[PDB]
Amino acid sequence: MKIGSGEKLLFIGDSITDCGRARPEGEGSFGALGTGYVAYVVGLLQAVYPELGIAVVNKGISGNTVRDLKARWEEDVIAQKPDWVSIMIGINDVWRQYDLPFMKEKHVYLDEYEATLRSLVLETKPLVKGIILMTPFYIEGNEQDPMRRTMDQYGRVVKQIAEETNSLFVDTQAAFNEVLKTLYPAALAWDRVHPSVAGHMILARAFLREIGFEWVRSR
Amino acid sequence: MKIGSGEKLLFIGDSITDCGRARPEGEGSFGALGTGYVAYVVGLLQAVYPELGIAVVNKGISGNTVRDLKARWEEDVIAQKPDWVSIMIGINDVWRQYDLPFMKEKHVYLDEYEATLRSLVLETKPLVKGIILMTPFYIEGNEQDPMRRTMDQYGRVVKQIAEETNSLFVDTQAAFNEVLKTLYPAALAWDRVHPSVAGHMILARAFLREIGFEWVRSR
Amino acid sequence: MKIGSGEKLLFIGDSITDCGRARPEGEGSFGALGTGYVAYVVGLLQAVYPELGIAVVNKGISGNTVRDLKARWEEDVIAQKPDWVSIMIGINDVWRQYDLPFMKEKHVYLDEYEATLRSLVLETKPLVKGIILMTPFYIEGNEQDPMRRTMDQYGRVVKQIAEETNSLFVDTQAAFNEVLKTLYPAALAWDRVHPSVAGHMILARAFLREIGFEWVRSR
Amino acid sequence: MKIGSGEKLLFIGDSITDCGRARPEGEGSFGALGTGYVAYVVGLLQAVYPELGIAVVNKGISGNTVRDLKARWEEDVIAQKPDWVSIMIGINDVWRQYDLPFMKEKHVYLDEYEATLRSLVLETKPLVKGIILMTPFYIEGNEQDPMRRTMDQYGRVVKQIAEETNSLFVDTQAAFNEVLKTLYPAALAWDRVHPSVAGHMILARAFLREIGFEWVRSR
Amino acid sequence: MKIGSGEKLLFIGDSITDCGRARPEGEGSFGALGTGYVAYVVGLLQAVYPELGIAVVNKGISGNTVRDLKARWEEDVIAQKPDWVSIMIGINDVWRQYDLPFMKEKHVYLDEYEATLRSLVLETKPLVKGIILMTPFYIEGNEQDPMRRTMDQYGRVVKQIAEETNSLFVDTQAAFNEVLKTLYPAALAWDRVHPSVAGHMILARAFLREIGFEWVRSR
Amino acid sequence: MKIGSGEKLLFIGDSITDCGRARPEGEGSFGALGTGYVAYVVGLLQAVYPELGIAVVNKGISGNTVRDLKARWEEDVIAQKPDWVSIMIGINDVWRQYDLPFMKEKHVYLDEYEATLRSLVLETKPLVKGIILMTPFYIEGNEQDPMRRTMDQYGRVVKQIAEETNSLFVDTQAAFNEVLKTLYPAALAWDRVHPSVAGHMILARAFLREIGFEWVRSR
Amino acid sequence: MKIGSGEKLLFIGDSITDCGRARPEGEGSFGALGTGYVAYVVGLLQAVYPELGIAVVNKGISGNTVRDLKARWEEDVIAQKPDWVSIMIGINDVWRQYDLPFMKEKHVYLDEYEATLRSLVLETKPLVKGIILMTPFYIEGNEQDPMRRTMDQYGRVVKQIAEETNSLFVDTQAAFNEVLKTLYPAALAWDRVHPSVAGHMILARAFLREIGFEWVRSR
Amino acid sequence: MKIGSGEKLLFIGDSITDCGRARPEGEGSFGALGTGYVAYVVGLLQAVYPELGIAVVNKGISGNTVRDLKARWEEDVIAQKPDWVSIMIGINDVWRQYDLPFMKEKHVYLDEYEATLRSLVLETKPLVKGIILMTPFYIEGNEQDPMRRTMDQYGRVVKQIAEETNSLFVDTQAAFNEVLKTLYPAALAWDRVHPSVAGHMILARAFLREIGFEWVRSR
Ligand SMILES: [Cl-]
Ligand SMILES: [Cl-]
Ligand SMILES: [Cl-]
Ligand SMILES: [Cl-]
Ligand SMILES: [Cl-]
Ligand SMILES: [Cl-]
Ligand SMILES: [Cl-]
Numbered sequence A, B, C, D, E, F, G, H: 001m002k003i004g005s006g007e008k009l010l011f012i013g014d015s016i017t018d019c020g021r022a023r024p025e026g027e028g029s030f031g032a033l034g035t036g037y038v039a040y041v042v043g044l045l046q047a048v049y050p051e052l053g054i055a056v057v058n059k060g061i062s063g064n065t066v067r068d069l070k071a072r073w074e075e076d077v078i079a080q081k082p083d084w085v086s087i088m089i090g091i092n093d094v095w096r097q098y099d100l101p102f103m104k105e106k107h108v109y110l111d112e113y114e115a116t117l118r119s120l121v122l123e124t125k126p127l128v129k130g131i132i133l134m135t136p137f138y139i140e141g142n143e144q145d146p147m148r149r150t151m152d153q154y155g156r157v158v159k160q161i162a163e164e165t166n167s168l169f170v171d172t173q174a175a176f177n178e179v180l181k182t183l184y185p186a187a188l189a190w191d192r193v194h195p196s197v198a199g200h201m202i203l204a205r206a207f208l209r210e211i212g213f214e215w216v217r218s219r
């Protein structure tokens, strides 16, 4: 278990993280944590590690790119004084290039994405105990679909930033890919991005595996 | 322009045809026709052929397969006494195979599809001036995406039936394919099925081209 | 096709342009473009010219006169840095004189209308690639109905401004008049201003004809 | 004042009479009478003849033609046992001819109108103290506007019937015509049918004048 | 007719005047004038004096005392530049003394009422063509009911202010008292203040009588 | 305390008893008992006699006269098998005579009232441990106000019946009269019928006093 | 009766006091006092002491701790110039320690609670006629349940502050404990904090007993 | 993993099982399964065993006792033809004894509980591959709290039945007990019954452990 007792864990990201969380505070009840992977992570940690004693905050905002995260970083992350910061961002950075290809101001291309995400992680690292970087993902099994291909490229950036900064790393793409050996995307997400309960469990399980969660603790 | 004044044109199909149309009647004003390709067709006919005087009915129902159409045909088509019947069905027949792959009873496989659709055309043809068969479609440019590949099989059945029965024929998939040379599917439909205004205009224009609509009339 | 690839097209006007568009931004989805002629124009351009690569913004506001357009021009037009600006204004300038004849402060008489519209076009022209001026209209076939008569006078001003400034010009009155040879007004608009889908197609088709749209492209 | 205390006065017609009245009963409070000329009549009678004690019922139904009135007459008029019946019908009978000119089955032409309305008066007259026939109207000052011209034909039938049957008679069109010497139709009704408070007051006053109301009573 | 052509008439008061009028503007449609005596006055003036050419504004606010009127006078009356100002205030000034007798800060006793109302009329008179002062009222026939008695005292103040300033005067109490010879209060207002349509007609008729309205004009 | 544990106490009457109670059952939780004197009685019994275990049902229905009670007695009282029945009726029987003075059929005059109420008590008495008759009331201190004067007549009938039948008896009018030595009616009820929390507490306390409630129990 | 005629009584606290009171004012009608113990106190005082002449304000806010009370004290208490101030606070101060044990910033531990409450009472006492301090409570009969135990400790602080400052004192815990000899908590409050009508009567009765209320006054 | 592909797993019980599931069918999508332990189980099975293809039905109904289950068994269980049936019942059977202690008819005592539950298992066992009996629970760590003590009796009956009938068995109370070594009940459920996401995860994990779920599969 990487997270220690008494620590504040803060999750930030886009709609995948948001899932109807309470605005602005994003804390104070599960209602406040929204209805997806964040709530499931916290629930399972409480079910299996109730003594862990963690405080949890959800600052996900629907629609965000890393550019949006940067504009609110000071208030929504630094000022919350978390011990651990989990980030999952890139889906919209990429998706806008494909769904609104001619509105270029909505796009966050790979150069802006890497520089901005790198910079948020470098600035934040000295202020906290740890960072978890979760790749964006696209629920699509064909590596040569253009959006999947670009999303994998964004994920490489996240992975390389995690390496360089000694952050924990969750490859969310790899978690979906495993299930995508059996299921066509639409069985998890009609839109290849916003999934069912099952997709949120895929995410929660990937996160928990990386922080050293055990389903049944051996001690 | 194949349709003549005083004639009734009835559209039937799934959500793509439905688009929020009024239930049960689906007739009498634009709002009753819903907010997609059906309404656009009717508005373009009225804009360009105001003297035609066509009665238009929308019997689309969201979620339907051809198995659902056969079950309501007597009341929703035969009893309306149309002069022209437009059919667009097959999306769900296929989609269920991929989004609920273990609920087999909800699947309509190609052999049932073909014979059922054939039955509907053969039943209706003696009572009407004509039939327009629109293929289903999937907004996906990769011919090897499993659902796109299945959809094309169903589309080929539709075309066989239209040739055999002397029905009018609209290849909706080929109309999308052309636009998909440029746009990634998400720019038309996040879910690859339900599209923007643009996609409804793709459909409307394909239908109008097949019935002999002229954008500026010659005479 | 007058509009070039990669360009930003901005539509401004009154409720006819607005049609429930998203406030304040008016961009980012068709939902955001509202449900009338603007959305139809953009849909048909995407259906038939998908490679055109255009970005579209709707800044229509219900109720506006040209006086209202002037008060928000800087923020809603100049600052959006469009390449092309389409304007359709005058309906309310005129209608208030007839529906609220004793509230004179709501009226924008011909002198204010010409000076203000001329001035917005002159100021805007050097900042953009092109301007489309669409006449206001009144869905009324009798040239001697007082409001139709005044509305034609407002349209002459728009036409003369378009000439003098080398702007494209859409005579929306002429488009309705053609259909008004067959249909009584109420069949398109009970109120002679806010029409059905069919009226919005009349408008969209008139606009597209002027920008060199082809229904079926000859190359 | 033709109406006597303890008597029941029943109004029937289309939306102009309906105005949101309570369904099915249309009786018992002001809210139940709806928000137009019927309620105004009743409020002015109560203001000026509080001792009268008149029961008032509103059986208007929006959308109705005289063909719709005949279909519900037994339940909505005969079974109410009124002493006075006020009829205002014909607007829709005409309007459909102009707003849905190709839906002929929805049209009630003048020959059917006349005989149906005549039938209703002849059926009802033996059971009541009196009948008031109000003409339909169209808020349009040009006598050659096709719908205004048709409306006047129907109005002339109403007047013939009232003379033949000794019914009370209210020329609503002539009451509007006087105001239309000054106001353009839109200042009373955008759609030329459904009017402001002012138009409902035009109607209320015309009706009251015909039944012998005095604004300040002499005795 | 005291009011002249082309003039702006502004009504101010409490809920009796307000009647759901549009906030903040209170002008631009009857919807905007609310659903009581103000709308009825304006309707009848338009029905019978359509050439009068008057602009009308409703600034009634539910709950107001004269103290509230004073706090908003500059913005809601002076700055609207009316020609004629009608005031009906005092009901709440008085009612709070009886319904919330121990919340004395809500009460506007006779000294504050006279000084404040007098002062608003004196300040306003030089800026306008005329003032109409309408007494408050209480729909209660027993002169010795304590609230009726106090309300009559407030009405004397209004009357004496009207005399001294040469303002028009409407004794609303006298109009209700006439009807209260026949009807118990509850037949017009359960609460003795907020009446039915009939009460609003009693008010409208009293106002119109004072401005020289004729039901049928003699010229 | 006249009521014993395990017993069912059923209240019936008009809106004063109803207060938004659940329909049809009017039992099972506080919300089901509505928000006035019934709920207060039950909450005070539970506060002070928690060991009693009384089932309470609220069968009030807004608008009812004693004529309405007789029409539903079998289902709403007899079929509930109560041990105690509380009746409070008469307000509407009277009120209609004053708020709809010409709708005589809606009036229940004193002779019908008396015999009907007598009938209900005589029917029910053999089946129950006891009956509590609560007088109607009118919140009006002047004994000569016509409705107050009529109400007192009905109240006197209720008291005669209770003496003749050995029923428990609550003079609600005398409880209000005492408070009306100090407060003007509007401080309790704008409409003189439906009161504040205070008025419901007046009623609750009067009822509890009659059944032998002690605020602090002696034993 | 400790409270004197003409005095302003202000209640402040958490949701138990709030009970849906009107924000921000919390005065001007019972609707405004909310639907629990405050409204019941005021109702019973008016029912039994109508001449007392008291003005009442409810400033309860759902969720508050004493830390929240301090942040709004100046505006919500001092500036209202009450004569008497009743405080009931501590439930949330304590409950957050148990329901959100790892969010320590939400907790108000005993040192902050005593210092802050003591300080508010000392600052307020010279400005008012009297203070009533009501203990917090927890509807739980087992003195050794950890939250009940802590809540009793908070109550001791309130009691000792009341002693030292000569404030009136209501032991709300003792009032519930009496009823908890008969009833399991869930019969009054599923959550052991927010009770039914009956719990609000338990509270109201405890408050009234302390201010010298008599159910039946002996003079 | 005891459950096999193509099999139907049906859950039945009270609100804890219901959680807002779709009525009547309780099948077909996640939303139809509601928002608690049932949906979590299904999402974890799909996440980790996507190839299984299990049909899942939720027949929970809020408020139910085992007496309510027997009354609807034929339609809600037998007619669904499940392969596996999960039962969790008893919370209400007990809770009513403590929250409505004098409404004895609403109580299901242990002797009726045991025989009814036994009957259901014995009826169903021949038709299914297996039965899972989940104990009821009460989130309360003190074994002497009267309701917790009663709940444990019912739980012991459930375990006896499961041993006697060879059913699968989930001790939900023991799963909560472990977490209650650390958390006070309110941190999981204010009312000690309806819990947070964490509590639903406690339940989901206990159920999954009993059916042989592996968090990371070995094979
Ligand atoms: Cl998003
Ligand atoms: Cl569909
Ligand atoms: Cl507009
Ligand atoms: Cl109509
Ligand atoms: Cl008011
Ligand atoms: Cl009632
Ligand atoms: Cl609270």
Ligand SMILES: [Cl-]
Binding pocket: H014, H015, H016, H061, H062, H063, H064, H092
């Ligand atoms: Cl439940």
